[PDB]
Amino acid sequence: RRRIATPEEVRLPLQHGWRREVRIKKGSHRWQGETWYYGPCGKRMKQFPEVIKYLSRNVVHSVRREHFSFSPRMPVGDFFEERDTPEGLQWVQLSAEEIPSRIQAITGS
């Protein structure tokens, strides 16, 4: 990233209306995770080029593209881990304490 964001900046959107969920799933090769975002007044984005367009199309002054980070190593909003249960596959939410443990697996400089 050309501009590195802080968790405080990434929660900045969460303070204004945006939300951010991180989905962590076990891959066939590696541990992976992805960060999702939702417009507080519009559609939902999980790609960087989707966020830049939202800002350009709508009026936003509180949060800029920098406040949005899709790195699953950012322990800001919600973290989930896909798990199997006797009822089926369900996305289990990770606590703040569990977050960094999962990040270590999905981490990638």
Max distance between CA atoms of the chain, in angstroms, equals 46
* C-alpha closest to that of 32 among 70, 68, 76: 70
Q: How was this structure determined?
A: NMR
Q: Residue 7, CB half-sphere, CA atoms under 13 Å: how many? A: 8
How do the domains of the chain map onto residue ranges? Answer: 1-109
Tell me if 34 sits within 8 A of 70, measured CB to CB: yes
Helix ranges (DSSP H) in the chain: 7-16, 48-57, 99-106
CA distance 59 to 4: 23
